[PDB]
DNA sequence: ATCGGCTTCGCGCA
DNA sequence: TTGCGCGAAGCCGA
């Protein structure tokens with residue numbers, strides 16, 4: 001039994017006789033999952049087993065092997081984890097609107113549950129699934145602490161507007177997780193080949209170095225529920241105490257390193273928050289970190305949920321479009337094309353340094369993300385093209401890419417969504433400016449450049 | 461209300 | 475480096 005404001009009736013309906021079916025999507029984990037926890041609870045009152053069903057869409061050919069393997073190795077571990085609680089896992093392979101709604105038929109499912117994403121394509125799928133199922137259809141926010149549609153019913157203009165609203169809801173929703181009770185009813189293709197198949201598809205596209213070896217180094221983030229925990233734990237032990245004072249230094253590995261895990265659902269951020277809240281470190285440090293994993297993460301959901309064009313110019317706030325529109329004819333000092341950005345071929349060795357961190361590691365430092373996308377706007381031929389170029393490089397190369405945090409962060413950087421207006425520059429209007437020189441007062445830039453020094457020539 | 465306060469940007473200056 | 479103030483800037487919301 002759990003908080004019901006975590007649930008939303010999609011298709012009002014009458015209960016079916018068969019298994020309760022969890023259509024997993026965003027939250028790829030067995031522990032700390034309110035979606036799976038609710039489907040087990042309604043599975044228990046109907047005395048049916050609960051099964052999980054995952055769909056593998058052809059969206060993987062938009063990304064690279066790095067994302068596809070991180071997740072495929074992640075699913076492979078969950079699969080063993082679900083089986084131990086007697087919950088079988090089914091892996092469909094196609095377009096969900098057709099595939100889920102015909103799984104529901106072939107399987108006589110009693111009722112249907114999914115997790116919550118604000119991305120446009122998921123909602124498109126749901127309404128397809130809804131039109132073609134008889135059984136009721138339930139939705140659970142397992143990704144935010146406070147449910148997106150409960151935190152605030154409108155678009156939030158800034159962190160300080162949303163921050164009260166979220167924090168007066170924290171006592172009621174920041175609670176611990178119960179246990180996933182294993183199935184008691186035991187019930188009636190393979191992830192190996194699907195990985196081999198998908199890798200073969202993506203190989204022609206891999207990002208190589210001149211010497212025909214790949215760029216991406218797969219050893220900075222082991223994928224999986226197990227590996228994620230040892231990251232959250234090492235963070236609370238080694239880094240959190242100094243997080244607030246070094247969050248902004250791209251030479252200190254002092255971030256949480258959590259975002260590939262949170263993105264794929266491999267760890268609950270509600271578990272993190274519990275574990276930070278009880279953990280005993282710098283009060284300033286906890287407050288800075290909680291503002292990121294709580295306020296900034298869950299507002300980025302608030303962004304895409306209430307702004308369908310979250311990845312377009314029209315989503316920017318009224319003043320910001322006015323400013324960029326005023327400066328559309330200004331002569332840019334430089335203009336680069338996508339693949340020149342991609343290949344680290346700017347005049348700015350600090351900018352190429354971080355492009356190099358993105359290519360080789362799959363995670364750009366969070367301070368260097370704000371700079372990277374501001375310099376794209378400043379050296380691209382138009383607002384729209386900057387956006388386009390930045391999303392394409394983010395989602396193609398970030399492990400945490402294709403995520404509401406990506407868009408709301410790109411919108412923040414380029415269009416100022418969730419930000420204020422600043423002193424008026426040429427080209428970038430009133431958009432918050434960051435300078436190379438700003439980064440020199442904050443951290444030894446020569447060390448950052450030095451680290452990824454000798455990848456540009458080695459991968460030209 | 462109508463005036464403070466805002467992811468803490470950048471750069472002077474000590 | 476590293477705080478601390480000051481400048482330029484639009485608007486939510488109490």
Ligand SMILES: Cc1cc2c(cc1C)N(C[C@H](O)[C@H](O)[C@H](O)COP(=O)(O)OP(=O)(O)OC[C@H]1O[C@@H](n3cnc4c(N)ncnc43)[C@H](O)[C@@H]1O)c1[nH]c(=O)[nH]c(=O)c1N2
Nearest residue numbers: 255256257258259292293296297366373400401405406409
């Ligand atoms: C241009 C640009 C591009 C991106 C992003 C921001 C910007 C400015 N972000 C957000 C942020 O850069 C990223 O979430 C963290 O750096 C991920 O690293 P850590 O988890 O180590 O962060 P860290 O430990 O500092 O923070 C912990 C968590 O806080 C959240 N968080 C931090 N900064 C945030 C931000 N500005 N917006 C939203 N949530 C935030 C994340 O969930 C993050 O994992 C993003 N994030 C992401 O998950 N996927 C993406 O594709 C992108 N892309």
